[PDB]
Design a protein around this nucleic acid. Structure first.
Lengths: 83, 97, 99, 329, 103, 96, 110, 83, 98
DNA sequence: CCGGCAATCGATGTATATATCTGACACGTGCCTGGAGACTAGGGAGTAATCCCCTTGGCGGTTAAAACGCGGGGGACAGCGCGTACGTGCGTTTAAGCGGTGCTAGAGCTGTCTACGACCAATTGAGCGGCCTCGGCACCGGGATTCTGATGGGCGG
DNA sequence: CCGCCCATCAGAATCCCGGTGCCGAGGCCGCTCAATTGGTCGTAGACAGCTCTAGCACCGCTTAAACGCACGTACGCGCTGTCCCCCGCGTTTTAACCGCCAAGGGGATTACTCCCTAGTCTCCAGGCACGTGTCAGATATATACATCGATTGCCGG
């Protein structure tokens, strides 16, 4: 479709900020590609589960409840949204 | 038209907070987090009790199952105080029924 | 000659600054575009609520921060200061996510 | 006849209960408690050829139009054909001889040390100088000091509704013109009346007060006519006021200089609507409300207020706005 | 009311109703809701007290999710209980390795 | 007194094994392992279906819940074939 | 006649796993208030398919080792050598199973 | 009678054999104590859970099904010993 | 002239041998004694079935083997062929066990 | 005239072929309890119609963040030498393993009967949802303060 | 003659107040319905008694494994030198964010059938416990076969 190559929107300074919050002092020049890959895999899994959940209910809109249920099924509980 | 009502634990959480800290408030997001925490703990304990009742070939849930589930699910220091509080509440309820 | 800090000071300042705040560290529109593009593969003409995208962002950021912490530990274990892809691979292998 | 002493109208006990409020070229308005009721004492020097606050004092006959207008507008509240309770009613009026009591001077000193005063000291007055003492009901505090504790735009809609009703009633009664209306002349007080009642030209109507009663002070330059006799203080010579700049009031002043081609003996009710326009500009740019605009009902209310502010100028008088405009129908 | 006879603040009838129609067992005794309500109230009180202490430390009079995260992560038992839980708007505990510090 | 009876899945597993490899045997420990495997998978699928039914405010379990639980739990190609099998079975049961 | 001959539901569905037993287990398991009429057939078909796959792989592994009987070692070899099966049974321990032979290349002699 | 000093029964050759099955070529001289500590912690947790399970049922003998239930609760499902 | 193998050959032989069989590698009586001694701190006068002891032994051996595999990986990562306690500590920290 | 590279040579542990012997596995039989056939009552689920809230799309301004270039200092990486901790093998000591023998504490099963939980009808007060105030809380702007990093200036064995 | 210490200077980091903008408590009504009170009634489980399986204790004899010691070498660790490659700072270009405004698509609510599932009674066939052989695998013996470590034997600069 029209939406393509949006993985490049995760800029290098954003990854640097995440690393700084994680507590990293020096970063090599080949980390951004690996970070993009792992983020893509994680998002793919979560979104697939959420879309299955929204498909079972005969709806056309993905809600926060579906995301929460998918995350809980994956083993990562999330507090603050619905519940 | 009035929407369908929704149940939560806001009132009781606020009552407990006023009991502990008489001059502290709370924000909406914190209240939502507390609601989620209460629901999660309730579900865990209830599921453990149901499994325990099923293992021994029984068809009823009593306070013994709840006590054993609390003993299994919580660490020791929290478990002792929770057991004491539950036993005291049950004794007080039964005495003045 | 203009003032210049030694390499390593601003990094520590940023480390101390970003460990006290709570706001998100990624822009919203690019993340929304990425989420929609990924989701278009499973079903055509989907719609989203704002809370769903917000929750996805929160979960992704938490996961990335934890992974970076583990990677830093792995890099320190090997008598080094910089983090390299081998550290990420080792952390993911031990965590059990990768085969 | 003859002036009465200070103890005749303001004895010592109600002299010590006292606090200062306001000052001006004419005299000073000042708070006390009398008959278990908070009242305002207004003191003007008369018959004094002495330079005070940059000018000398006029005679009693110059003040006479002001008291005429004051008691006429007070009786307007007791009128049957056109009744409105949003105005100020007098208590009495008297003449005082002597010098300023020391308590007044000490209250002025406290006010200047706390709030600051741009007027001269009142202590040079002699023991044979003549003053006029006037009594007002305590109408509350001014709109200027109250600008940052208002609840929501509903209170606005209410206070505009009430003031427009009051002006329309006054116009229908005695063809009254104020010709001066700034956001420091509106007094609001807390009342328990949820729905107030009034009469206009023989028809009963009501205003939702939102638990708030309003009033506006008397005007020294207000113009009206009773039975063909016109009461108005000529302002064609004080062009300094209309040549000022810095905010909208001087713009309104030059509009009221231009629309009536300096023939002020006639009646021009149109400039009242521009006087209200000034208040609308103030409310949309000079006040803070305590309620967020998130709810769409009051959002559309605000948009309606905005289009009123934009489109009122095509009417002819406040009565037309009251009887035709969408916010008022 | 049942919750007043037990000296509790959390509801007892509501807990009984939620237990009875959640597909847990065929029958539910008359003592389980009291025990469950007491346990839930105790845990809530403990967490709230810790969070309020953390909030008062930071010179504020209201509790926000940062305070809840600080209270939970600084206690061993609560941290062990919520070992796989993520709190929105939480942040992380300040911690820097000693090797990275300047000489 | 009389000894109770114990139920297992040994005969069905043996039938399937004879269908696949008609000249192979099995031991007791392997039978126990297969029994445990079948019980575990049954429990997982049933629990997932129950949760799905409870989420949507329903009071019955149908084939849709089982299909969705199978899709959610089984990974990759293992899901696809499995789903097909189930569908076919249901169709046959409707014919008779 | 008053009644016809009894026909098992498995025969009508053309399966080998029991359908009535699965229906009874679903009903008396505290899962839902009611149980439909098509769920047991689906569950039995899925279970039979999975069992057949595992047994096929294990039998091949046993035939490789020159034996005519399946033991837990063969089951472990079959499970650990397939990606999908290994992912499904990722947290399960098989008794008397062993490990997959594997040595790191660095430790090998030059 | 009371038992004491039994952790020393996990001899060094047994740990060496376990390491060899794990794929280790060389072993330091201080691994054995750490291994003994880890084993002690693991056994303590599992045995505590099993004893609680057997105590709820009003019994005086620990059965295999209690151990299986404890292992499943811990997240280490085991196949073969019934259940 | 006695025959002697170089350091490393016998280790590889043992690695190959022990990765092919499936028996238990710990003696049974000491393990049973240790289990009873640990259990005696929670209740007094307890009895066990042999199946319980066998299950505990199997689970313990599997856990130890997996831990040793992770330790070997960590040791290899740092340019070494000898395992050290720091490798075990790092593996346990990353796995999530305190 | 050596440091090497290939080619043997001996020794050791592992894989392979053949004959016996056993106990675990593959069927046969009897019986009973759980599943199938037939029928009825009612309520959970499917469908159609309607309302309106939330999602998608568009436009303009401003400005904070991303992108690019460059000099240089500190860190990654390879090479080398030294010392000792760990691997391999041999002789001696220890306790696991196997085969019986005996005893009894406790798991498992059955029959009675009483109390505790399910169900129903009439009453009513707790809890939630609209509309409205508002007193203080968090927020920013300024200024001041402080504290830390990067620097040059020296006495000395 | 190699320095390793001290006193100054700049620039972030944090404190104090003053003025603004909203939010989280509170109040009212108005319900709605879910929880409480007072009864009946059928069965789940507590309790007592009995049977007998398996868990525990002890003893004797073999042989494999654990243990202690000697010796040598390969691996871990510290030191030095070189070069690339990220870090800090300045300038210019891109699009994110905020505010506002319509359009309508689909989620949520109400009313009305009606077909699918629970419950009951009767009957018999599938599956489980028990009992018997016989052959796949375990064991013992002998026999090659691949591989490791040392020695020889020429060989080109």
């Amino acid at each position: 479709k029209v939406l393509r190559d949006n993985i490049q929107g995760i800029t290098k300074p954003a990854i640097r900020r995440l690393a700084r919050r994680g507590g990293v002092k020096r970063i090599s020049g080949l980390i951004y590609e690996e970070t993009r890959g792992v983020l893509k895999v994680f998002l793919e899994n979560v979104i697939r589960d959420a879309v299955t959940y929204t498909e079972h209910a005969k709806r056309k809109t993905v809600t926060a409840m579906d995301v929460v249920y998918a995350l809980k099924r994956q083993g990562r509980t999330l507090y603050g949204f619905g519940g | 038209r009035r929407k369908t009502r929704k149940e939560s634990y806001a009132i009781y959480v606020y009552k407990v907070l006023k009991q502990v800290h008489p001059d502290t408030g709370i924000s909406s997001k914190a209240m939502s987090i507390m609601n989620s925490f209460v629901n999660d703990v309730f579900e865990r304990i209830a599921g453990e009790a149901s499994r325990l009742a099923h293992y021994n070939k029984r068809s009823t849930i009593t306070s013994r199952e709840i006590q054993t589930a609390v003993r299994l699910l919580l660490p020791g220091e929290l478990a002792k105080h929770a057991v004491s509080e539950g036993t005291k509440a049950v004794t007080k309820y039964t005495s003045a029924k | 000659k203009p003032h210049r800090y030694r390499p390593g000071t601003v990094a520590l300042r940023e480390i101390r600054r970003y460990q006290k705040s709570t706001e998100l560290l990624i822009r919203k529109l690019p993340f929304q575009r990425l989420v929609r593009e990924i989701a278009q593969d499973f079903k055509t003409d989907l719609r989203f609520q704002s809370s769903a995208v917000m929750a996805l962002q929160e979960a992704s950021e938490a996961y990335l921060v934890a992974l970076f912490e583990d990677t830093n530990l792995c890099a320190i274990h090997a008598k080094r200061v910089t983090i390299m892809p081998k550290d990420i691979q080792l952390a993911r292998r031990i965590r059990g996510e990768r085969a | 006849k003859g002036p009465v002493p200070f103890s005749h109208c303001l004895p010592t006990e109600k002299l010590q209960r006292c606090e200062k409020i306001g000052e001006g070229v004419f005299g000073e308005v000042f708070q006390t408690i009398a008959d278990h009721t908070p009242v305002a004492i207004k003191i003007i020097a008369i018959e004094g050829p002495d330079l005070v606050n940059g000018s000398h004092q006029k005679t009693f006959e110059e003040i006479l139009p002001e008291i005429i207008i004051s008691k006429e507008l007070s009786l307007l509240s007791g009128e049957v054909c056109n009744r409105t309770e949003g105005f100020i009613g007098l208590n009495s009026v008297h003449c005082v001889q002597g010098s300023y009591p020391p308590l007044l001077l000490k209250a002025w000193d406290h006010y200047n040390s706390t709030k600051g005063s741009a007027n001269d000291r009142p202590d040079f007055f002699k023991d044979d100088q003549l003053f006029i003492v006037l009594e007002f009901e305590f109408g509350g505090i001014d709109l200027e000091q109250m600008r940052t504790k208002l609840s929501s735009l509903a209170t606005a809609k209410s206070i505009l509704h009430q003031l427009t009703a009051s002006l329309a009633v006054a116009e229908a009664s005695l063809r009254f013109e104020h010709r001066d209306l700034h956001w420091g002349n509106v007094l609001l007080k807390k009342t328990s009346l949820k729905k107030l009642h009034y009469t206009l030209n023989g028809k009963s109507s009501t205003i939702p007060s939102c638990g708030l009663q309003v009033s506006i002070i008397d005007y020294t330059l207000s113009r009206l006519e009773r039975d063909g006799i016109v009461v108005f203080c000529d302002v064609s010579m004080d062009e300094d006021l209309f040549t000022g700049d810095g905010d909208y009031q001087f713009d309104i002043y030059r509009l009221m200089k231009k629309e009536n081609n300096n023939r002020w003996g006639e009646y021009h009710p149109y400039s009242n609507v521009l006087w209200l326009h000034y208040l609308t500009d103030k409310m949309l740019k000079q006040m803070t409300f305590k309620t967020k605009c998130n709810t769409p009902a009051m959002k559309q209310i605000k948009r309606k207020i905005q289009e009123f502010h934009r489109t009122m100028l095509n009417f002819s008088s406040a009565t037309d706005l009251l009887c035709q405009h969408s916010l008022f129908k | 009311t049942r919750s007043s006879r037990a000296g509790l603040q959390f509801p007892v009838g509501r807990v009984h109703r939620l237990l009875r129609k959640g597909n847990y067992a065929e029958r539910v005794g008359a003592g389980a809701p009291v025990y469950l309500a007491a346990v839930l109230e105790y845990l809530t009180a403990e967490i709230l007290e810790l969070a309020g202490n953390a909030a008062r430390d930071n010179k504020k009079t209201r509790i926000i999710p940062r305070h809840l995260q600080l209270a939970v992560r600084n206690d061993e038992e609560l941290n062990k209980l919520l070992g796989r839980v993520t709190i929105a708007q939480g942040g992380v505990l300040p911690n820097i390795q000693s090797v990275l510090l300047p000489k």
